[PDB]
Amino acid sequence: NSFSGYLKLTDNVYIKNADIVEEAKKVKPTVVVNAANVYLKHGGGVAGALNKATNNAMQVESDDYIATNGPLKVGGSCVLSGHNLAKHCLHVVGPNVNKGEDIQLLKSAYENFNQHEVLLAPLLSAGIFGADPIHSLRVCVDTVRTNVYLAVFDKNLYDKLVSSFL
Numbered sequence: 001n002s003f004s005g006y007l008k009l010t011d012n013v014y015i016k017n018a019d020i021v022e023e024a025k026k027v028k029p030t031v032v033v034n035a036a037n038v039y040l041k042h043g044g045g046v047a048g049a050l051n052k053a054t055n056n057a058m059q060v061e062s063d064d065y066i067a068t069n070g071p072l073k074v075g076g077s078c079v080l081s082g083h084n085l086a087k088h089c090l091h092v093v094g095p096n097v098n099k100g101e102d103i104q105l106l107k108s109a110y111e112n113f114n115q116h117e118v119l120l121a122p123l124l125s126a127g128i129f130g131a132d133p134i135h136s137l138r139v140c141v142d143t144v145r146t147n148v149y150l151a152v153f154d155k156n157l158y159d160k161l162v163s164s165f166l
């Protein structure tokens with residue numbers, strides 16, 4: 001968990017303009033969060049990038065988890081191997097608001113972060129899931145009580161977040 005170049009927004013929320021895959025390779029955190037869907041199919045976005053960095057080992061493990069346990073619920077999570085990126089990967093499902101899943105479930109999604117003392121994570125329900133990313137950071141700040149290090153890929157979004165926050 002040797003994080004560098006973060007800006008402290010609150011007592012427990014830190015932010016950096018970084019690619020989460022590169023941060024995971026430098027820091028080797030105990031937990032990296034994946035922005036997953038309920039069937040753990042890592043087709044694009046953060047999930048596709050983390051899976052590609054494991055050379056599809058995350059997808060093969062995820063398929064075995066789904067065959068044995070069934071899909072996750074929206075707002076839910078599971079802990080699987082972090083492979084070469086982290087000790088563990090916490091796969092978290094935020095609501096896809098573009099598909100009618102309630103925005104209220106973004107709070108439930110961030111509550112899964114509280115099981116882990118320190119996490120490297122992306123913003124949840126952003127990208128194709130359609131939530132406003134600044135709203136997602138607000139929910140993160142209001143819900144997560146453990147130490148979260150957020151990696152925001154787009155510099156334009158990073159600047160809007162830092163301006164809206166501290």
Ligand SMILES: COc1ccc([C@@H](Cc2nnn[nH]2)NC(=O)c2ncnc3[nH]ccc23)cc1
Pocket residue numbers: 018019020021035036045046049122123124125126127128129133151152153154157
């Ligand atoms: C479907 O859920 C999503 C959640 C978040 C996301 C977005 C939110 C975002 N948009 N501009 N910066 N951040 N984040 C990433 O895609 C992302 N973030 C950090 N490192 C990365 N490496 C490769 C991809 C990537 C998309 C989709």
